[PDB]
Amino acid sequence: STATLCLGHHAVPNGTLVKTITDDQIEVTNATELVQSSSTGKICNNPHRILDGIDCTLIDALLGDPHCDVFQNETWDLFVERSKAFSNCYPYDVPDYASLRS
Amino acid sequence: GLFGAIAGFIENGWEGMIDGWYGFRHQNSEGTGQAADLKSTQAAIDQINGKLNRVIEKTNEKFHQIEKEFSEVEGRIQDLEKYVEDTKIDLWSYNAELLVALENQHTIDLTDSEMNKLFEKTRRQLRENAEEMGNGCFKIYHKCDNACIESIRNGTYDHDVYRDEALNNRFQIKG
Amino acid sequence: GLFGAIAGFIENGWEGMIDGWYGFRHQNSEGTGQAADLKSTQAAIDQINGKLNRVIEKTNEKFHQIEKEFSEVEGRIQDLEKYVEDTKIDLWSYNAELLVALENQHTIDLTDSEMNKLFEKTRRQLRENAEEMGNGCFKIYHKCDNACIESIRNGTYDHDVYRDEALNNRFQIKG
Amino acid sequence: GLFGAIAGFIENGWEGMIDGWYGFRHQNSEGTGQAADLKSTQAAIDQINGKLNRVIEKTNEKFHQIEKEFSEVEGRIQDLEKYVEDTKIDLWSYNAELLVALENQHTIDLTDSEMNKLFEKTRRQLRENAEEMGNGCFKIYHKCDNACIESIRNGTYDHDVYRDEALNNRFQIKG
Amino acid sequence: DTCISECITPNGSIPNDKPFQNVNKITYGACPKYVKQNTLKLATGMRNVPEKQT
């Protein structure tokens, strides 16, 4: 005889669950992530100034351990201190090392 | 469904409407077909991509800070250096674990909006010219077709001129 | 009453409807009776107990922390150990004194929803078959009774079949 | 325009309505004039100055704290005293820079509420006595005038008594 | 390594586009404020109702 008119939204089958003020579970069309899950595992040499302490520890690089000569007059933006790191020189104690470091 | 509509009384899912986020379904003489909308599809997604620009990609760049992992037992200062940072995290977390709960919940009554505001639109540009068959879909009295369709589906509809079939098939027919 | 309804245009309080959180009042030939609902009563309370579970009984277990009360005047660290803990309480409070404000105000436009989405439903499953007498209550043209009631009060109502009394008592009778 | 109305389907700006925040526009035989409202103009502005009293003029009075500017390099404690306070500012700010986003967005769906709850009111106290001419404005069948106006503009309107012009000029006139 | 990434974590270097990261409380400059939660999904679209059987 005549015409019928239906109206609405739309949808999908691969919906993802979410949380809101009321439901700790709901299936919306599309949602995105807001929490950096994990990382690759390498430090980008840029855009910062990175300096591998290598075996030298900043303090030792400071004082001038027999073997940190390599790090003379150095500079940076982010000094990275390593684990395999050590000091090979007249044993010493820096009171409030923390700060002399920081 | 705060506004009601979606997952409320239009309890059906539009399977694969891919030409957008909204639209209608005409059952005219020429058969059928689910048409795509705009000022509503764009409208909603207009906003969603607004609240989000806010959230995503923005502030915070801090350089030299306080230490946070510790090699030997120091006491006090240590204790403190912790409880300060911990407290931060804790806070920043609750702030986040809600920015969502809100932004999210309201992301919803934001879509369940454009709906209850379109059917609530057609049901305006046309008087006794037709009524949402029960609920969900509509009911027409005129012999509207693919061409005739570009009426509502364009807000180009005279409930005045194109009115002939009024009282008729309604309450007028035998009973 | 953001949605309007409650304490809006249904300005009367349902005294002692104990068989639920909602319902109707029929004035058929069989006298009267305030009937109790479900998909709205369980519906709202479904949600309230939802946002709540969220709030109530959850996180936070912290063991060794910083001290917070002090026996002698220390200065600096002291000052700080305070100011840190003070700042915490202070923040945590404002988060609290608003989690309420919000969850609370929206707890409302959530009840004043189920209302303005039921009258808005009856006023769908039945065409010219009746109209909400002025406001608040409805107006019927058929001689509906206790049995006939399980129509809308079950969504089992034909505005097509059970339509007889249409135009009539409406705009049809003398004037 | 969550609720839709404002900046929604009443797409016109009421230029200089100063006798209030709302009102109508009658096109009777007596010409025209834009009347001012109340239980809606006060109503909305009733709440704006409520959510506001909340924000504005309130808490926070703190005396002796931690310093925040520093003359010489001290390390550690220094670092901390900063990062403690810095963290504060940072938080309080997000707490602020949102109190707005929310309170502000919802300040809106609160104005676009009173609207869609007045037309939706006139469209209640009067049956087939008239219909919102398409959208925005209304359509009357009766010869209402400056006096007759104090009907809706007072909730003083009988869609029963003052009904005469019903079916008529509607779907009744030739077609 | 050779690349760019305004954010350094003892854990590696991460992308700053998100707002929150759960990589490591220790960061360097441009970086996602650290959160306890390992994931927080945000609705980009409207709800959703199942076709058949969900």
Swiss-Prot record, chains B, C, D:
This is Hemagglutinin HA2 chain. Glycans are attached at N154. It comes from Influenza A virus (strain A/Aichi/2/1968 H3N2). The chain holds residues 346 to 520 of 566 of the full protein. Disulfide bonds join C144-C148.
